[PDB]
């Protein structure tokens, strides 16, 4: 299969299972809502080495927002729901209580978990607190120095899908690395879905264990490598590829996940250069959620 | 004293010592220079919570760097020296060996204290890697999917001071953001500091304990919150005061921490409707080091 | 009236007829559409004395666009159909074609009014010049040293609309910017108008002719001019009130005008400070086009 | 001769003399200092068939401005001072006059030359304007809806000079294209230069003349278009070489334009996949100014 000249191999991303919170913050100007969510989400590329797995979902528009401001959606991932909770306290209090001129409202208000984050955040105002209805929503005024923080009571929580992906093999560096970010901005724009790494992008990849340090949980995949592709004979780098990026995609369902890979990959596409798209995974021993390339089109 | 009109408090700030890692990430671009050490400097504005205490400390201009590309230093502080280096693997390992056309080297080269970050990364390679010397430095190339990703065998720390600041009284909140906004850029073009909070400014505030909530060891200042200072009979806010903002500054020595504190105060009062700066201690009972608002010009 | 506890003036703004030539320019991402889109609407806030105004609409999906690429949808007016043309030959010929990666397609495909810039811009090729169909249009190829530069055949122009507007009234200069800021990135998000001034903003204003220097074509309206309410008997701006902005909507028809209008106040009015919102008319003798504000909610 | 690998042409880029006026503008904060330069220089890629050929020079410190506050220098160049002096007027009064929070200062404060733009926009106050001194300046201060505007009296200008470049020869479009970003955001660090093309950069190329169109002053130039290398007998293209991007920089002096070719061409050979850098130039028949390549090393 192709698109745009670029094939499309037949083949599936293995996704598994994840805790993930939804939360919308809301600022001043987009600028000051977008500081408060990058830095919430940062330090949060792969739960299996950060304390999460956390990203930009979409910018929310002042037309849908509780407060009538521009917002930002993000969602916060761990594969425990306590350790998900810990999370959304330690990020969304110092790092979006902190912010200048944001409030923080519930992502997920029909999720069966409802973690109290607004509750546990208002003692921060040591006996200052008061309760208001900010369009039909519990939230609680905590007083700082800026004026008021304003927080909802809850913070909802389902089990999404973390793994989501594909990859992008160019001509160069930075044909590949253009593919990904074009991918990037389109996944931006979609709800439902995140892309933990750094920019959105996995410049790394990565095998399970290893074959030389076995002690290691894991390891650059050398056949992904095309610095090393000639030492490498089962090589996955063809002589006209000199780089491979993966956006790695994490969301609320199976169907927000493939609209995220389908438009990802069709924008991917669009740049001189592009020889391949496709996908990792596990050979189904691992991951339950399996996306196949091809029945995205 | 008055800067452009507008009241300086004979005050201090009241710095603590801490533990600081220099590290220059560079990049194809600007850009991606900055998606790097954006994400590994996020999710840590106050080690009295977060995992660190983390920031951009200025760009790195290619006619400057060891490989000649555009780049970003920043700062990752800690308590421990044993939690630092920590931070740094954890921090460098998920967030910039993984982010698009990265290359990490060591900010703080001529140090006593030196992690050995680049020599633990390389085993990310599983036997592929390759020693590589760039402008006289030893560096570990490190095979991954996009090419090879080049890291100097060690980071350096240092024992620094974190907790300098300044407040900023406004008129109104936009006012008082404004003035911080003028000030944290202005610190972001100087050597040696960083200021770690969500977009290097602090809503929030604190003091050192409870009035109420005795189980918490830092809540919101209440003498300082605006929206509450007709019920707080000994409130600092003005009537004609609505918000304050504070910038927290860490940095290298003592000298960088004054440069950024007093071209900081004089962007601020540059905005219109500032009413005043002042400045956050503890007494002088917490902090060693005491950085004189007056002394300062 | 009052939204969000801010005064709504029970006025109108006075809007004149002008033509408008929409035009899409793709790129390889977001970050090269916008360089392109604003490199091609710079210089052009007002007609008359720039030539032209111009804007950025919106951004277009990479899911909407002829070639599947990230785009910028931007308008390009004045007053006669003849100068619209040679605006859109400079602007797209001289910002567009010489920008990296570029693409322009037809904006008002369904127009009747149809500017061959793409036939004109063919020329340049001297003989390399080629013909495609991009998603059933008509496109030329236009080799450059950067590859193919492509331009659909034509350029739709309709009679719009130029001069909706309305006044933001703050308590500071920061605060009246901030909720126009974060009105001008509301209209942004909409489709069918642009907000032509730097950064959207007017921060000059206008009254036409003059009280002493009788030719001059425009000056500064003292009425609403914060800095000098107490030696001017016929102010405008309350005691309480420091700044104003105005923010200029160009439009497609008047049902655009009146969505920008409406969810710009709305925006507007959710930062603390804002005393008062109105509109900037001629007393309904210069302006065709009437749009009150009562009316718009 | 070779960089980092990639062979320098021993060839010169051909320059022309301009009229050039340095103009500072600062603003409340980068941000808003950025707005008001770049709609201020758009529409100014190259005097041929825009009003003016434009751009940004570099940031300026809070620290070295007159009134403490960030700004942007930008130059505005045209071949007669005639054209020049309205390009000021127009361009500053349509675009910074009106642009939130900025003030104006002179550039060029030595210049034999000095247009009295600063004088001639205090007219727009109708009488309510006045003088004052900034850091020992003579400014007029024009009330507007904001507050404020400060114009200088007068914008400096000299004879400088137009058109130094280099050639960046990439195996890829987007390899080509990001050296080039690498380069001008260089070349925007250094004092004394613009790149007027959009974003800095030019995607076109041009020779003087035509082979079929003579009604046309320019056309692209047929040998260095990588998209039909393989139908022109005579071209510059090797066989490994998809893209070609130019740098064209205009400057007050020689030296500082060959500072600015020589860090953008060692920024531009930091990209992986840049096969050659060269240079455009016109036999040494047109122009006063040749600047050999071999010669900046």
Redesign the interface.
């Not at 830095?39 to 792969?46: I, L, R, W």
């Not at 160019?170 to 253009?178: E, P, V």
């Not at 992008?201 to 990849?205: L, M, N």
């Not at 290893?210 to 340090?213: D, I, L, Q, R, V």
């Given at each position: 299969m192709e698109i745009?000249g670029v094939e499309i191999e037949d083949t599936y991303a293995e996704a598994f299972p994840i805790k993930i919170a939804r939360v919308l913050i809301t600022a001043?100007?987009?600028?000051?809502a977008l500081?408060?969510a990058?830095?919430?989400?940062?330090?949060?590329?792969?739960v299996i080495?950060?304390?999460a797995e956390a990203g930009i979902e979409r910018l929310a528009?002042?037309?849908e927002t509780p407060?009538?401001?521009?917002g930002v959606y993000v969602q916060i991932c761990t594969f425990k729901y306590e350790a998900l909770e810990e999370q959304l306290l330690?990020?969304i209090?110092?790092?979006?209580?902190?912010?200048?001129?944001?409030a923080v409202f519930n992502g997920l208000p029909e999720a069966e978990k409802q973690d109290n984050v607004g509750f546990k955040l208002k003692?921060?105002?040591?006996?200052?607190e008061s309760e208001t209805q900010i369009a039909g929503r519990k939230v609680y005024?905590?007083?700082?120095?800026?004026?008021?923080?304003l927080a909802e009571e809850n913070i909802g929580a389902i089990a999404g899908i973390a793994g989501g992906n594909f990859?992008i093999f160019?001509?160069?560096?930075?044909?590949?690395?253009?593919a990904?970010?074009?991918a990037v901005?389109?996944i931006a724009?979609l709800e439902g879905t995140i892309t933990p790494?750094?920019?959105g992008?996995?410049?790394?990849?990565s095998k399970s264990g290893?074959?030389?340090?076995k002690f290691?949980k894991?390891?650059?995949?050398?056949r992904?490598?095309?610095?090393?592709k000639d030492?490498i004979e089962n090589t996955e780098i063809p002589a006209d590829v000199?780089?491979?990026?993966?956006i790695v995609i994490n969301g609320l369902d199976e169907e927000s996940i493939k609209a995220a890979m389908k438009?990802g990959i069709?924008?991917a596409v669009?740049?001189?250069?592009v020889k391949k798209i496709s996908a990792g995974n596990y050979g189904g021993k691992l991951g339950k959620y399996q996306f196949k390339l091809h029945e995205l089109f």
């Open positions: 745009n001043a100007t987009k600028r000051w500081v408060a990058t830095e919430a989400t940062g330090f949060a590329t792969s080495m950060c304390p528009s002042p037309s407060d009538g401001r521009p330690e990020r209090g110092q790092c979006v209580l902190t912010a200048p001129t944001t003692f921060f105002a040591d006996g200052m005024k905590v007083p700082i120095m800026e004026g008021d923080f990859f160019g001509d160069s560096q930075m044909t590949a690395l253009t990904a970010e074009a901005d389109t724009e790494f750094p920019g992008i996995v410049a790394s990849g290893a074959n030389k340090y290691l894991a390891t650059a995949n050398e992904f490598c095309p610095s090393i030492k000199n780089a491979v990026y993966e438009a069709k924008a669009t740049v001189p250069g």
